[PDB]
Amino acid sequence: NAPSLISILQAIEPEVVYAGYDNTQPDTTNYLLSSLNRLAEKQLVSVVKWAKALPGFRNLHLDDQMTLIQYSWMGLMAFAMGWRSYKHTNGQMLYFAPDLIFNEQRMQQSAMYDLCQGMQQISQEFVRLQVTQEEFLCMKALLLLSTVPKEGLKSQASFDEMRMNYIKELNRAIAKKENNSAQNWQRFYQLTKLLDSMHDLVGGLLQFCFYTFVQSQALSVEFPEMLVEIISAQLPKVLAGMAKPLLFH
Amino acid sequence: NAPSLISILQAIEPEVVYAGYDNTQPDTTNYLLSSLNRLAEKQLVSVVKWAKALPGFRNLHLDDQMTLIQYSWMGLMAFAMGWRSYKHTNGQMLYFAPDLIFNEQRMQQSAMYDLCQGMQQISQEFVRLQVTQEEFLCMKALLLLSTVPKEGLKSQASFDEMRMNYIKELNRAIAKKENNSAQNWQRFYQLTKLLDSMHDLVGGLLQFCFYTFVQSQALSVEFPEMLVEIISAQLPKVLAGMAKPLLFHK
Numbered sequence A: 001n002a003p004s005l006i007s008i009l010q011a012i013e014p015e016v017v018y019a020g021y022d023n024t025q026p027d028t029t030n031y032l033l034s035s036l037n038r039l040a041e042k043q044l045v046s047v048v049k050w051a052k053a054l055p056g057f058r059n060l061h062l063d064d065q066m067t068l069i070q071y072s073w074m075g076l077m078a079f080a081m082g083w084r085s086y087k088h089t090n091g092q093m094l095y096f097a098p099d100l101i102f103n104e105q106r107m108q109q110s111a112m113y114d115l116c117q118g119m120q121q122i123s124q125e126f127v128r129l130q131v132t133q134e135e136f137l138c139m140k141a142l143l144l145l146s147t148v149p150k151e152g153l154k155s156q157a158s159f160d161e162m163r164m165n166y167i168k169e170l171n172r173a174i175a176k177k178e179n180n181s182a183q184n185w186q187r188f189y190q191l192t193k194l195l196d197s198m199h200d201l202v203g204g205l206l207q208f209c210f211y212t213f214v215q216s217q218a219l220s221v222e223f224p225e226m227l228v229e230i231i232s233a234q235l236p237k238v239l240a241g242m243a244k245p246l247l248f249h
Numbered sequence B: 001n002a003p004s005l006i007s008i009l010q011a012i013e014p015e016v017v018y019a020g021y022d023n024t025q026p027d028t029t030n031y032l033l034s035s036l037n038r039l040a041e042k043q044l045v046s047v048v049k050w051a052k053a054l055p056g057f058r059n060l061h062l063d064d065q066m067t068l069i070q071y072s073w074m075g076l077m078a079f080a081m082g083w084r085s086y087k088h089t090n091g092q093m094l095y096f097a098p099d100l101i102f103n104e105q106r107m108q109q110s111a112m113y114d115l116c117q118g119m120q121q122i123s124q125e126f127v128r129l130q131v132t133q134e135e136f137l138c139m140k141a142l143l144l145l146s147t148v149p150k151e152g153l154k155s156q157a158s159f160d161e162m163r164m165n166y167i168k169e170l171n172r173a174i175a176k177k178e179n180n181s182a183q184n185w186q187r188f189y190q191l192t193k194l195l196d197s198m199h200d201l202v203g204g205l206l207q208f209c210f211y212t213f214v215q216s217q218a219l220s221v222e223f224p225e226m227l228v229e230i231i232s233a234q235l236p237k238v239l240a241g242m243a244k245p246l247l248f249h250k
């Protein structure tokens, strides 16, 4: 056979990115929120390299490629962050970058606190289910494919296929580790139910992101160049409500 | 909107068939089996009427239609039978027809007794699960679609899509109960798992049917005309192993 896409997912998985954060700084709301936005920009390049290499993706209309990234960029970063929080801190802390990690204090100072808790719960869920690296990588792919234009895509031809495979390949992963079907059947629930749960969270994250952005002047936080563009394009579409989450349940 | 798949399903559900059995007769292996085979013929005709009226069915290539039936005819009848046995006897007895119902003694004389038990366990599942009539109708539609030719279908064009609709429809039916996603997922698991259990049973039934078919002279068990051909046509394909059951997990 040809290489399993899972084996390719592993190959194209990005290496971790540093924030270039200065940890001697007092933890100040504005400074935290801004360095986070710096991090996002760096990660934004990473996730885009990734999606390109992501099998099936290039075969979508570039307006399709462009929209999917626009919607899901937040969820993918947040999801991946929760998986780092799990491997490194055991869901105890929010591990954004090896050099910027949110302890309790920082979550309170972020003025994102309730949103931080929410992200943390995603991480703890990872530790509760003991998600395997394979499960994670498949899930993260599906996340990309889990929010779509309310009016459907140009490549919907290609898309519905791709989405199916990554669902299939997710099954291939739940099946391999475990053995019994009663088990497979419930794994699949808990995992997909985890993916679904991401949507509500992202909404909240976005809500605040948008807010910080519009009020960036007043609040005095900085969104860097590349980051603005993406938000700028996304903000209107999602407020228009052209963005449809695809649930499992 | 346009009428529910499930509302059509209900419309086209066959009325119950009578066997025309003389219950004053003694309960004897040959008269019992022969009488079932008469019942199987009568049901056979309505099963086919049913499948035609089944939405998305006539859109399948006509070889696919004939194939699928030959495969699942046994499972449909036995599935339906266990449903009746749940509705009328509460899983207690085997209600093939209102006039011919197997109680313990008849399962003894049947000389299929371990199979009778098997079928009695299907109905008992219906009762353990408290299956709704809507759940039942969707499952029975799928049962048609759950054993396919191993080589594939001429138009798998349509089939795959149709099969999904009935799966969606089945979810539409579980959801109605107003449960949450986890209960729904659990209903779904336990239904399709009742479904899948059907093959094991049916395999066994086919076997003893094939047997009684061949040995009828020996056994003095008479297969009405129309029952004969379907078996004639099916038996080869089966023993060649060209029939692939479609499961919901191993």
Ligand SMILES: CC(=O)[C@H]1CC[C@H]2[C@@H]3CCC4=CC(=O)CC[C@]4(C)[C@H]3CC[C@]12C
Pocket (backbone or CB within 6 Å): A033, A034, A036, A037, A039, A040, A043, A074, A077, A078, A080, A081, A096, A205, A206, A208, A209, A210, A212, A213, A221
């Ligand atoms: C400054 C601001 O509005 C906050 C709101 C939500 C925050 C983001 C939440 C998800 C997250 C995961 C990461 O790995 C770093 C960047 C991001 C993408 C965060 C960057 C800073 C954000 C953008």
Ligand SMILES: CC(=O)[C@H]1CC[C@H]2[C@@H]3CCC4=CC(=O)CC[C@]4(C)[C@H]3CC[C@]12C
Pocket (backbone or CB within 6 Å): B033, B034, B036, B037, B039, B040, B043, B074, B077, B078, B081, B095, B096, B097, B112, B205, B208, B209, B210, B212, B213, B221
């Ligand atoms: C004589 C014989 O081979 C028996 C073996 C199993 C029996 C069948 C079991 C399933 C059953 C359900 C019905 O409602 C009547 C017909 C049938 C289809 C039965 C017809 C007679 C059978 C076929």
